[PDB]
Amino acid sequence: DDLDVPSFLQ
Amino acid sequence: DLDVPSFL
Amino acid sequence: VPVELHSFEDAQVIGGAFRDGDAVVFDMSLLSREEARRIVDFAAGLCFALRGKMQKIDSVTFAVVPE
Amino acid sequence: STIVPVELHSFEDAQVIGGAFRDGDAVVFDMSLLSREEARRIVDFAAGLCFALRGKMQKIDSVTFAVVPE
Ligand SMILES: [Mg+2]
């Protein structure tokens, strides 16, 4: 639950 | 073994 | 679309609805940490390819939005 | 167009695969510098790219794959 949207998808 | 996922 | 994920094979449900032009909200509470990482990477791939939006709702909930 | 080759160093390097692929180019990527789990991540991301655009994905060897546009 420490996961997020990869930064380069911004 | 790293393969193509079945649903492809 | 509120997909409850049981394994990585359920990526196909997210993929199928998303490429059909529908927003998908998926739950990863049943998945292991390794499986959730796989789902997020697959979903990131789906989004990148179609220039869609991906957002984390809460710790085990993400959304993939078309166009 | 001709196949774009990629030597991957990290998961952020998937952006090269994604960028060239969504532009309609076939991409051949090498994962020999990637760890076991990083390669797993790349393959899942590439599978996502492929599925969204109805492209073809193929294993060349254990560290080499290709993503081909529809
Ligand atoms: Mg590296």
Numbering used by the authors:
A (entry chain P): 433 to 442
B (entry chain Q): 434 to 441
C (entry chain B): 70 to 136
D (entry chain A): 67 to 136
Paste lines from the article:
To further investigate this hypothesis, we removed the helix and crystallized the resulting SepFΔML,Δα3 construct alone and in complex with FtsZCTD. Despite a different crystal packing, the two structures did show a dimer-dimer association mediated by the opposing β-sheets in the crystal, generating linear SepF polymers similar to those observed for the B. subtilis homolog. These observations demonstrate that the β-sheet is indeed prone to self-interaction in solution and suggest that the amphipathic helix α3 might regulate SepF polymerization. When the same experiment was carried out with SepFΔα3, lacking the regulatory C-terminal helix, polymerization and vesicle tubulation were also seen but could only be partially reversed after addition of the FtsZCTD peptide.
At the cell division site, FtsZ protofilaments form a highly dynamic, membrane-bound structure, the Z-ring, which serves as a scaffold for the recruitment of the extra-cytoplasmic cell wall biosynthetic machinery. Here we investigate the physiological function of Corynebacterium glutamicum SepF, the only cell division-associated protein from Actinobacteria known to interact with the conserved C-terminal tail of FtsZ. Our structural data revealed the FtsZ-binding pocket, defining the SepF homodimer as the functional unit, and suggesting a reversible β-sheet-mediated oligomerization interface possibly regulated via an alpha helical switch. We found that FtsZ filaments and lipid membranes have opposing effects on SepF polymerization, pointing to a complex dynamic role of the protein at the division site, involving FtsZ bundling, Z-ring tethering and membrane reshaping activities that are needed for proper Z-ring assembly and function.
